[PDB]
Every structure is written in C-alpha cells, then in structure tokens.
C-alpha cells in the first residue's frame, strides 16, 4: 500500500515518531475548528458583496475538520506498541493506515479555495466562467491522477513519479491562471489592497508547493538516505499540517483582510 504502512510493517515506529504524528494530526483539525468558529464570527465585518468568501472558507473548515479528524484518528489506531520490541507496528486486526481522508478532503477544498478569490477582487479581461472552469477542471485533475501516483508510491517508484508529473501539469496551468488573476484583480483598487494581494499570491504559491514536497518527501533523500525510514513520515505528516493551515486558514483571515480594505471608499 502506502509508505506509512510499509514503516509500521518494517521497521515500526518509535514513540517518538508515533507521538509525534499523532499530536502534529490534533493540532491540524483543531485549528480547523478554531478557523470555522472564526469565519462565521467574522462574516458580519464584511459588505453583503463580499460575504461569499467567508461562507466558502467556513465550508472548507467543515470538510478540513472532519476529514483530518478522520485520518487523525486512523493513524493513531493502526498501529499498537510492541513491547518486546519497544516500537509501534502496523496493526494486522486494525483497518490500516490510509491516505484517502486526505485526497478526499483535496477533492473537496482545491474547487473552492480556488473558487472563493472570484468574491473578492474583479477580474478586467478575463471572464468569470472561463477563469471558475479552468480552475475546477484542473484542480479536479490535479488530485485525480495524483491519487493515481499515489497506489505505486511503494510498488513502482517510476509510476509514482511519472503520474506525479502528470498532476504537476495541471498545478502549473492552476499557477498560471491565479496569477493572472491576481494581476487583473490589482488593477484601480487602492495600493493596500495590493499590498494584500501581493502577500496573498506570495502565500498560495509557496504553501500550494509543499503539498507535492510532502507526496516526494521520502525519496528526496535517495532510495535508502536518511527520509526513507520514519523521519520521512513525521515530515511528511508535518509539511501537509503547515500546508493545510496556510492553504486554508491563513488564505482566507488574508482575503477577508481584503475583502475589508475594499469597503474603504
Ligand atoms: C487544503 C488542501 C489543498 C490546498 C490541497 C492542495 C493539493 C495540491 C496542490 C496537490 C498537488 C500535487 C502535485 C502538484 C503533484 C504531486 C501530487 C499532489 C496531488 C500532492
Ligand atoms: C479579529 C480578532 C482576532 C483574534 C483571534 C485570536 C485567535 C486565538 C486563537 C486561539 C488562542
Ligand atoms: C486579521 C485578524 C486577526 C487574525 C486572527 C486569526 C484567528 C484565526 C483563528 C484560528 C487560529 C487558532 C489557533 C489556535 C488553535 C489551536
Ligand atoms: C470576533 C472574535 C474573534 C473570534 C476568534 C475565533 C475563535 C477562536 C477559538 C479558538
Ligand atoms: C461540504 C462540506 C462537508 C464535507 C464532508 C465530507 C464527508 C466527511 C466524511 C468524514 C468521514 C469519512
Ligand atoms: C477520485 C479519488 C479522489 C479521492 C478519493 C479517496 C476516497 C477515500 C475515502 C476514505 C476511505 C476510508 C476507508
Ligand atoms: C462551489 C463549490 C463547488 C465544488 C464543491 C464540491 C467539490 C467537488 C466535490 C466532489
Ligand atoms: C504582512 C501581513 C502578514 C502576512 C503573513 C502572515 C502569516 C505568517 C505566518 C503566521
Ligand atoms: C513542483 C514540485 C515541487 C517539489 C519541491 C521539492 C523540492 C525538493 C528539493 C530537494
Ligand atoms: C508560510 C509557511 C512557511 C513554511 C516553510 C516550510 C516549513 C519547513 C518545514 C520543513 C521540515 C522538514
Ligand atoms: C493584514 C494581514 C494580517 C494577516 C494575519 C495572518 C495571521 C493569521 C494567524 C492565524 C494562524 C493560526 C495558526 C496557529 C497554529 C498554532
């Protein structure tokens, strides 16, 4: 299956790297918690014409609790202490460690974070239908053959690598599309509300990127270096954490932030 569990299996895990990512996997959905008390608390600081945005970012709240929830929850019960040995190991009577919370819970917000910047900023040139259809078809392609990439990531390395080029394509044509977005959203509002535009493209380009960091993070160190054991797996599980509160969270605090700059008039 997946690399957690060919760890658990193998090598099992040492408490600390079981502890770990359990605590790292609490932390993600309770912020998620945190940010949906927030978002609807706040919907009342924003005019009627931007208020779409804070009900798409407490809709992806919802679905990041919950699913987070669940994965947090299969990764603690898939795996139970030896003590003859002292490590975690994969549980044969347990379900299992499995990713599909997570790419479920992509399928899901990717739509709608890309969905929720057309509420905020006017586009000049670009016409609302084509920018929403170029987003929701390759972001839905994106996770699509991701998910593919993923069944080999322990099977068939070159497998893994090539469908993870071929989701790569379609996060470049999202790259591109949401920068011109936000160039065309820049243009005649007022220098603070670029500012805040600036920071919010600076935010979705490098926190989208660690998304496939996490998927490669094992063989970044080679075929047998030093991420290809545990230290892989609580990084792994980390990078998707910091990626999950700053994709969604920190995102949409930054675009309600607009959002108010732009009642200002
Ligand atoms: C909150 C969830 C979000 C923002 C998920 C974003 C997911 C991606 C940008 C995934 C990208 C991938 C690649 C570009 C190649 C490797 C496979 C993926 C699916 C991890
Ligand atoms: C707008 C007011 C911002 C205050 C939000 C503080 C969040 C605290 C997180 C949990 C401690
Ligand atoms: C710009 C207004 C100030 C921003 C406040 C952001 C508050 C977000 C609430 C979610 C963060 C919770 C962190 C602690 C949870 C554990
Ligand atoms: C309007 C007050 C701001 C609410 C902050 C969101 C609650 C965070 C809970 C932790
Ligand atoms: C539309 C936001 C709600 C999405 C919930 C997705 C289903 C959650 C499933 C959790 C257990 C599997
Ligand atoms: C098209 C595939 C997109 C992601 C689907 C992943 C579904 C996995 C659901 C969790 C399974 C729990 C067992
Ligand atoms: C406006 C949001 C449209 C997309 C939400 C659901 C995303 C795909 C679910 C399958
Ligand atoms: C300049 C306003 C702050 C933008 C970045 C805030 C998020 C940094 C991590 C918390
Ligand atoms: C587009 C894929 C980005 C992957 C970033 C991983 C960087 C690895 C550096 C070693
Ligand atoms: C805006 C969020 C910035 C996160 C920077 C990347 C965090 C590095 C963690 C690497 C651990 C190995
Ligand atoms: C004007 C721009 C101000 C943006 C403020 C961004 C800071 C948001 C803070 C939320 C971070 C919550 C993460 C807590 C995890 C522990």
């Given at each position: 299956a997946n690399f957690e569990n060919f760890i658990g299996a193998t090598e099992g895990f040492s408490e600390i790297a079981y502890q770990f990512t359990s605590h790292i996997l609490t932390l993600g959905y309770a912020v998620m918690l945190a940010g949906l008390l927030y978002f609807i608390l706040t919907?009342?600081?924003?005019?009627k014409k931007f208020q779409m945005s804070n009900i798409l970012s407490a809709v992806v709240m919802v679905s990041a609790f919950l699913l987070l929830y669940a994965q947090a929850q299969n990764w603690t019960s898939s795996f139970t202490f030896n003590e003859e040995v002292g490590r975690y190991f994969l549980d044969p009577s347990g379900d299992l460690f499995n990713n599909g919370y997570r790419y479920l819970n992509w399928l899901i917000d990717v739509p709608m974070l890309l969905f929720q910047i057309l509420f905020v900023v006017s586009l000049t040139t670009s016409k609302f239908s084509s920018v929403r259809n170029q987003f929701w078809f390759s972001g839905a392609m994106m996770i699509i053959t991701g998910y593919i990439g993923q069944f080999y990531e322990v099977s068939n390395l070159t497998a893994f690598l090539v469908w993870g080029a071929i989701s790569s394509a379609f996060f470049f044509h999202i790259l591109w599309v949401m920068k011109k977005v936000i160039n065309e959203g820049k243009e005649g509002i007022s220098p603070a509300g670029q500012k805040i535009l600036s920071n919010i493209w600076i935010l979705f380009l490098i926190s989208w990127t660690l998304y496939p960091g996490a998927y490669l993070m094992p063989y970044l160190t080679g075929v047998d270096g030093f991420l290809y054991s545990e230290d892989g797996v609580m990084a792994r599980q980390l990078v998707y954490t910091i990626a999950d509160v700053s994709s969604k969270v920190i995102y949409g605090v930054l675009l309600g932030n607009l959002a108010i700059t732009l009642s200002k008039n």
């Open positions: 919907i009342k600081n924003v005019d």
